[PDB]
Amino acid sequence: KEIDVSYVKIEEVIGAGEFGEVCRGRLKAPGKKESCVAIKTLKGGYTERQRREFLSEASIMGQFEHPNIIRLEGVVTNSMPVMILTEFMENGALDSFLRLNDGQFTVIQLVGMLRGIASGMRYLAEMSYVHRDLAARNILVNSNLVCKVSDFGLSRFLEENSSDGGKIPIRWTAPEAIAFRKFTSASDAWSYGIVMWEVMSFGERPYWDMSNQDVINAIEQDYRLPPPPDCPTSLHQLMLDCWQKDRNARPRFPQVVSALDKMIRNPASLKIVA
Numbered sequence: 035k036e037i038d039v040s041y042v043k044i045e046e047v048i049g050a051g052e053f054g055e056v057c058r059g060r061l062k063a064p065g066k067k068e069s070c071v072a073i074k075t076l077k078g079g080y081t082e083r084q085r086r087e088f089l090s091e092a093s094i095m096g097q098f099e100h101p102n103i104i105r106l107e108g109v110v111t112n113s114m115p116v117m118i119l120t121e122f123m124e125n126g127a128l129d130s131f132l133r134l135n136d137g138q139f140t141v142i143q144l145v146g147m148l149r150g151i152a153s154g155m156r157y158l159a160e161m162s163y164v165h166r167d168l169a170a171r172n173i174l175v176n177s178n179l180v181c182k183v184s185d186f187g188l189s190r191f192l193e194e195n196s197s198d199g200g201k202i203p204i205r206w207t208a209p210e211a212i213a214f215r216k217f218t219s220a221s222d223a224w225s226y227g228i229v230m231w232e233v234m235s236f237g238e239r240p241y242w243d244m245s246n247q248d249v250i251n252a253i254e255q256d257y258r259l260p261p262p263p264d265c266p267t268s269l270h271q272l273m274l275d276c277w278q279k280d281r282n283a284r285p286r287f288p289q290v291v292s293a294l295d296k297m298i299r300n301p302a303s304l305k306i307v308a
């Protein structure tokens with residue numbers, strides 16, 4: 035949807051993306067109430083390939099409609115700068131939000147967040163969309179603590195293409211996806227287990243200071259991240275399930291959502307910690 039630039043007001047720069055700024059703003063279109071939006075801008079200096087890559091995120095977002103997937107409002111393409119407008123998520127990236135709020139949200143709240151992410155992923159997998167970069171940094175959080183999946187793009191990672199989408203995010207990526215580049219919803223399930231660990235650790239870095247190669251070797255040699263401090267054993271077990279070496283043994287996203295829904299209905303169960 036092409037948005038007339040007169041309908042957009044940019045209010046403040048709130049972040050930086052791959053190709054430019056991220057801004058908070060307001061969108062007011064004839065017949066609709068004004069709404070808050072996030073705005074990604076692409077200014078001069080870019081190649082047309084880069085413009086197409088930039089705008090591909092909007093095309094993909096535009097294919098989706100789900101309360102746990104960032105909603106596209108529109109694009110500005112017939113003017114400079116080129117812009118992508120989405121709903122506004124007041125609290126930004128989940129990893130930094132949790133680090134700011136370390137130890138300040140209850141287990142039930144954290145499970146709620148995890149459930150929102152898992153529902154987003156359930157939807158993507160139902161749509162045969164493989165995310166490939168599922169990580170807490172790609173989850174955005176609104177004022178009501180609703181978590182939504184972001185970061186959409188279909189470009190191969192650098193390891194896939196010519197001998198001579200960026201690099202594979204090793205610490206989030208399933209071992210078969212690293213080894214063979216086979217990215218599937220089951221490799222996303224692996225990544226989701228890592229997101230779980232990030233959330234329950236209030237945004238610690240997966241594998242701390244281990245090198246990418248150390249992580250790869252450790253996983254092959256059966257190492258798995260330990261439960262974070264105070265983490266319910268049932269959540270850590272779900273993480274381990276997500277991290278099965280055999281991709282076919284990992285839970286699919288409907289089963290993940292079901293498991294989390296049971297926890298929420300049975301919060302006593304979350305009292306058992308190591």
Ligand SMILES: CS(=O)(=O)Nc1cccc(Nc2nccc(Nc3c(Cl)ccc4c3OCO4)n2)c1
Pocket residue numbers: 048049050051056072073074091104118119120121122123124125126127174184185
């Ligand atoms: C995490 S940040 O973007 O570096 N900083 C930030 C800080 C506070 C709130 C938001 N909030 C926020 N809310 C919604 C989206 C985004 N970023 C974003 C993404 Cl992720 C993808 C595509 C588009 C946008 O904006 C428009 O197009 N941000 C972002």
Ligand SMILES: [Mg+2]
Pocket residue numbers: 165166167185186187
């Ligand atoms: Mg991506």
Ligand SMILES: [Mg+2]
Pocket residue numbers: 167185
């Ligand atoms: Mg990415």
Ligand SMILES: [Mg+2]
Pocket residue numbers: 136235236263
């Ligand atoms: Mg801590």
